[PDB]
Design an enzyme around this catalytic site. Sequence first.
Site, PDB file in Angstrom:
ATOM      1  N   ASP A   1       0.842  -1.190   0.000  1.00 35.05           N
ATOM      2  CA  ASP A   1       0.000   0.000   0.000  1.00 35.05           C
ATOM      3  C   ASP A   1       0.881   1.244   0.000  1.00 35.05           C
ATOM      4  O   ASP A   1       1.712   1.423   0.895  1.00 35.05           O
ATOM      5  CB  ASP A   1      -0.929  -0.009   1.213  1.00 35.05           C
ATOM      6  CG  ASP A   1      -1.937   1.128   1.191  1.00 35.05           C
ATOM      7  OD1 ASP A   1      -1.987   1.875   0.191  1.00 35.05           O
ATOM      8  OD2 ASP A   1      -2.683   1.276   2.182  1.00 35.05           O
TER       9      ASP A   1
ATOM     10  N   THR B   1      -4.285   7.656  -3.581  1.00 38.43           N
ATOM     11  CA  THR B   1      -3.256   8.529  -3.027  1.00 38.43           C
ATOM     12  C   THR B   1      -1.968   8.466  -3.841  1.00 38.43           C
ATOM     13  O   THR B   1      -1.282   9.483  -3.994  1.00 38.43           O
ATOM     14  CB  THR B   1      -2.986   8.154  -1.568  1.00 38.43           C
ATOM     15  OG1 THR B   1      -4.191   8.298  -0.806  1.00 38.43           O
ATOM     16  CG2 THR B   1      -1.911   9.047  -0.969  1.00 38.43           C
ATOM     17  N   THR B   2      -1.634   7.290  -4.378  1.00 38.95           N
ATOM     18  CA  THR B   2      -0.412   7.151  -5.162  1.00 38.95           C
ATOM     19  C   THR B   2      -0.469   7.992  -6.433  1.00 38.95           C
ATOM     20  O   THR B   2       0.532   8.599  -6.831  1.00 38.95           O
ATOM     21  CB  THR B   2      -0.177   5.678  -5.503  1.00 38.95           C
ATOM     22  OG1 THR B   2      -0.036   4.923  -4.292  1.00 38.95           O
ATOM     23  CG2 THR B   2       1.080   5.513  -6.342  1.00 38.95           C
TER      24      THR B   2
ATOM     25  N   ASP C   1     -15.293 -11.054  -1.259  1.00 37.63           N
ATOM     26  CA  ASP C   1     -14.238 -10.130  -1.658  1.00 37.63           C
ATOM     27  C   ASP C   1     -14.454  -9.632  -3.082  1.00 37.63           C
ATOM     28  O   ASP C   1     -14.208  -8.458  -3.380  1.00 37.63           O
ATOM     29  CB  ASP C   1     -12.872 -10.800  -1.522  1.00 37.63           C
ATOM     30  CG  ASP C   1     -12.478 -11.032  -0.077  1.00 37.63           C
ATOM     31  OD1 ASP C   1     -13.095 -10.415   0.815  1.00 37.63           O
ATOM     32  OD2 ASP C   1     -11.550 -11.833   0.167  1.00 37.63           O
TER      33      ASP C   1
END
Lengths: 524, 509, 223, 460
Positions: free
Chosen positions: B48, B81-82, B366
Amino acid sequence: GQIIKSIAAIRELHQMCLTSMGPCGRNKIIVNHLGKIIITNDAATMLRELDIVHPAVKVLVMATEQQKIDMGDGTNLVMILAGELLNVSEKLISMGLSAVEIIQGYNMARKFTLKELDEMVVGEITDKNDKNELLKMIKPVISSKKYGSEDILSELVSEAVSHVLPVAQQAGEIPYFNVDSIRVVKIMGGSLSNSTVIKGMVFNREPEGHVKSLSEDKKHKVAVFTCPLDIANTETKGTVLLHNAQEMLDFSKGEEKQIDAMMKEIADMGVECIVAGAGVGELALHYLNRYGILVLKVPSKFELRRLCRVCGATPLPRLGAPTPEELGLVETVKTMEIGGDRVTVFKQEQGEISRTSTIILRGATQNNLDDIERAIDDGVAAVKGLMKPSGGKLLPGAGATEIELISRITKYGERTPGLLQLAIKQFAVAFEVVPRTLAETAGLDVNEVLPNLYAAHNVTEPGAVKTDHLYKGVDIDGESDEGVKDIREENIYDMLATKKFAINVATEAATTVLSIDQIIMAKK
Amino acid sequence: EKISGDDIRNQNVLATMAVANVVKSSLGPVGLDKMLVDDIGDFTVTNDGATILSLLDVQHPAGKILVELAQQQDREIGDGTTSVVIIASELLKRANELVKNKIHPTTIITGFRVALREAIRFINEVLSTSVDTLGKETLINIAKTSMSSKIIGADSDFFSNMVVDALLAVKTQNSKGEIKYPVKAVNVLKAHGKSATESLLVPGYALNCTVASQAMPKRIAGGNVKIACLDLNLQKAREAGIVLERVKKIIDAGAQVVLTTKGIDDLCLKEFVEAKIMGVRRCKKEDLRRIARATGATLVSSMSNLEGEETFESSYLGLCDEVVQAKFSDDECILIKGTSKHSSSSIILRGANDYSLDEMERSLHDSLSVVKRTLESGNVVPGGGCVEAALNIYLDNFATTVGSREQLAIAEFAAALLIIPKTLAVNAAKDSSELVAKLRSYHAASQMAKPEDVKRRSYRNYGLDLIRGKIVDEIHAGVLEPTISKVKSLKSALEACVAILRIDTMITV
Amino acid sequence: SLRRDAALKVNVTSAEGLQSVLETNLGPKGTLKMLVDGAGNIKLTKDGKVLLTEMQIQSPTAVLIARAAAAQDEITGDGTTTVVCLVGELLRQAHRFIQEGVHPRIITDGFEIARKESMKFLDEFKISKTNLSNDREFLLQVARSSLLTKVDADLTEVLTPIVTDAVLSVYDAQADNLDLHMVEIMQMQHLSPKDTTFIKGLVLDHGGRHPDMPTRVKNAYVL
Amino acid sequence: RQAQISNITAAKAVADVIRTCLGPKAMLKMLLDPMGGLVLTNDGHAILREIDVAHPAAKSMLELSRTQDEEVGDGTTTVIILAGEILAQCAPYLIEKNIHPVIIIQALKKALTDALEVIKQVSKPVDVENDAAMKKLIQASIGTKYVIHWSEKMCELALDAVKTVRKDLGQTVEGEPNFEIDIKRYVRVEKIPGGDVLDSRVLKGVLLNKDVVHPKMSRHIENPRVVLLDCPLEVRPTLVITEKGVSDLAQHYLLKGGCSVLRRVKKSDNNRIARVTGGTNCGLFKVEMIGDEYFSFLDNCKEPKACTIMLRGGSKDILNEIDRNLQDAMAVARNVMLSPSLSPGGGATEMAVSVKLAEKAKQLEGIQQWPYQAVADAMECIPRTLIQNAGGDPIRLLSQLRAKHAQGNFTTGIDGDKGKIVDMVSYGIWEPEVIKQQSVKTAIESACLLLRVDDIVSGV
């Protein structure tokens, strides 16, 4: 570990040759200590202009000259392959395999490769010396040197070769084509499309006389005189001096009557051209203009040798003795303006077939003008390779030969038991530098073109006999493409005499380096 | 010390360059994890990029601005965010090159603010809701790529049709037409019947249990049936007179379906045989709480409320159509369809063994998470580089409409968006120079005939697929992103870039 | 780009330095080494293990050599220096074979094979001596082997009857064993070492001080 | 690209040092501590824990050795050396050849599946139900140890110890349980001083050292019922067991109820009691004293797969040596029950994968073909390392061994005692397949994680 650092010293010069071979190659500018700039794309010529420090590098330089002197083509194939044989051997020397068995492995792999070269021949050159047949051999020679001129220079070089070769077939006893039969001249102005082909030597100097050119008469007589034009005197000393004004009228008129008497006997014999290798006096040029004799001065002794092979003239040690037995005959000589300047050329028509020709080059770029001059000389040696030692046989080029040898050598690797399997496998891997160099310099990804090259020569065919396309080579691209292309479209082939000779020289070059475990030097 | 001039502007570029290199390899799902080592000597392993920037130690006035920028996206969106750090890093590199061109920084700032307001308007024009439901398949490829790391991915083609069709109808108005999908629904069961590909979608609630004594009919009350949800048991309480009164309020209320968490005794079961009422023993408490919302009923805490005892007839009884019990292999379940208001369904997965179904059930939730998050926002945009590439060409011709020294700032702002697809293809081993270039070629001819309202071979929304190494539409490929994620990521990226360019001096004691 | 490290040339040489130190003091013709602590402690000892305890060696090779003598003193009690000379010299003889390319495992396994063959020749070379108590005359020459090593041989004839009669006095004749803890050693200064004599009983520290106490009392009762 | 070299050389330097720790001929090592002491043992698990490393990739390799040591007893150094050689062979491909790291990582994932399929074909079937055959398989971990005198008794004790925790069940209904064997918690042993090693038996249940708290009570119960509870005393069960102590007041209250009071029971033992109890269907309550200490029997007629082994011997020092030796002996026997297959040792399995990988990689014709040759060369370094420790020529013995696989079988390895190429099956050298499966899988998975980090972030 000096044997490892010796390869690293060659590795510094290895990447220099990797930027030479291929269409992406480029000349290197070298400024000599005398203030002279020599510019050429050929790497073998550059080695003579470079200062070599480590003596181990000179071994590859001496082996490089072996390729240029005999065959004249493939100098980049010898140096680049010899440098890669040391890199693949660096892993074997480190692995613990002795350099003795490494040398023995190359000797066994070399004999296996030479036997396969005879079975890889696709087409055969009939040696017809046709203008269209010479286009197949000359095209790959001009290729990987200068781009864009391969179409124009193909017709200029192939035309000059057919002029110096007589009409014969199936006769290899008497040689014909030499290395001096093609001379390269250059002049400022023009372009490559306006260039022509001359059947004889081309002189760019002035006639130095009021007679621009001779007539159209057949078989003009040409005489070569080594003695300068002047009144005959004693060979020892014999300096003309004036003691009093009385001897002035006798010595001045004596030179006028003696020279005019000797020029009259030459014109009566039918000699319209006089070649004087030495200087010409003032009174000599006056009598030659009235008799209509063309004035030509060739101080260089090298140009006089090729002139005797055409008309048949012979240099005379004396002056005033036009012996008709030693005189030459030229069909037509004319003075025309080519390239912006009026020059007197030398050509023929039918009889007295010339054994030496000269190609006139024109262009607006001075740097590319000298590059073509050095590129044609490499094409001259390509015609010499058409002789008896496997001149007709040819192998597909453009990286197709080096990749196909991988499958044949690895097949013999598992066949020969013992420790030789280590050197045989590494001997085939060393051939991967040729396709990788062309792909890396062309901007193509290694992860793309390289795996397609291995799949091109290795396929699964439901049958014992090979089929589909075995002609797939390495492509430089430059515009766009998918995968690779067939070499048979552009007809780019390599002669067997050039490829077979380059392998034995590159094998012995790497053998010498691997055999040397110690180097002793001394300061000068 | 006090510094100023071109020295502080060069330090801002070198500071954001090292920060961008940390998130350069972590961009996209193809990114790779990195290690963070402290002075103690310990370390950590995570993929992350948001957690890396939180523990990243950088001393620099502009470097700490990106730290607060990373926390702003995590506390709100939590994703992307990256990509925000990479955008703000390239803007600083191109802005410093304009210093030698004598470009004023305020014009660079004003050129970005004017272009940012017009960029959102252009993005709002290509936005579209969920489409291609008939004739094509969109949500199917989402569950297919998410299950590619599991054994279920082989049969995920047949399994995706049951999950997408179910969840499609689960949406409801919620509070004043919200249409927000629930985070947990469609309880998944397991069975050993036949193979894994034989799983059938049940349009309705499905409960796993039996009827105990088989003397009761499995199908009753076809026209209308009422399901009674009771947490209080009908079994003898640890006494005989109280449990009979609890049953008397049942048969008198007309409830054909009775659910008891602790079971039903044998004496109270005989009364249900003559009344054709289907009892169930040992109900799950977590199952019946969702039945109240699905069947419109209400969980009964106890019958002792106030001084009375009764089941509150017709108050807790929900409206249903028919309750039928289908015979299943291994464990048998109960089929409940046609309730008052449900809109939901259940998926019973039949397979070879429960060992594989345990991994398929956990992977289904998931994979459902990626589906419900994308469908949560009714306004979505195709990702994978479609936002940066389509806006790059539009700002080329739009930069002329403004001009006045601001055209150079818009041109550098548009060209700075090509770094997102560039660095994204680096981790995929694909060539970033060929993909980004060819991506502009396809969008160039696509927008030529777009304003003319006529097209032949012109198609928009070309994405980048790094799995197969080819250029395909990400809408059909299954990669979609909400509008809230892209708008706030692009707007906040410029907010931190302006504050960096406005600093001409650094004063440090 | 990397091949092995050759190693060695550090442990053998460091062990050669310890050999040259303990080569001079081995045997009755050896030398008496003296160590200095610096606080005023002076000890003169020819034993190898006693000196290694007072000497700190940074080389880890010599550390195991000192630890190898730990089992020698607790079992054999003699020959600690001889064992060290066999460890150091064996490395010098094997040093020539290592440089020739011989792998150390064959060198190591060759020592274990010769060790097992040495035990077979050890049982044939040994001589079985009877347990009779008439061997005290033969035990005199055996006791001199340990005595002549640590002294100058001038005090050997004095300590010969003392050491011999100390063990035989407390040892009845049977298999049994011998306990050296029952023999106490005391020291008093201001006298010559040639006055050393044998004591059959126990020596007491504090004596009676009074002029009228009898010096010699024959056949007295202890209470 | 410099960070990729540092990531390789981190695990490369650690692997090159432990190369001499492989095999029964493994050479001893010497570590220099700041204290005057030193570590003379050649055990790789003890040496790697005493080495201080800087680069974090070496710390990740140390964590892999700790996890590998818990699964199986031996082969810890094999995993670290195999993972370190893959990075060394792929170093020129990642740096000089300019190959993207994910391409190498993706190729290692495909090569991991192909490597496991070759080992399954080389392995040979074995009978796990034969008691005489299992004693010989364990004997490899018995001999050359202090238990060599008891080796005859150790093979029988280790046989019933493995057979006690294992339960054979399989079907396509509920899946494959894989026998659910756990050495740590379930096979946990309690050492009792005194007794005999031959008389030592493996009892199924929990053994407690506390006796009856009342002088007159029934010591034998037909159908005893165990009941567990937390809160101390201070359904009418036949027994009352309290975790904490019990006051003397509750002794007389529960005496008339026909139940025994048992106090002072550990918490870790209560979890294992739920396996034998859930207390009906309890086999034997006998409290009969063994070794001058009152015991209690919680056992039954069923196989809960939980128990406490009763170990007895001549002294406490003997039981301490048997402890670590029995756990290492059961680890070899546990791998035999995970699958009825055995693999040739001495490097034969290592060479069997390298030969089949080079032939299969030629038919793929893709970008992944190049790193497969690096993996095949890494598989040959494990038996070649034993050759360097055996004194033989590593160049000659490696080429001759590789040529025999194309002609003969894949079971021909290298002997440590002799040092020449010999057959492993005929000369009695065998190894289980699970060690080979865990050595290849964990080394490739760890090698991929080291290549995924292209930058070292410094910060808290």
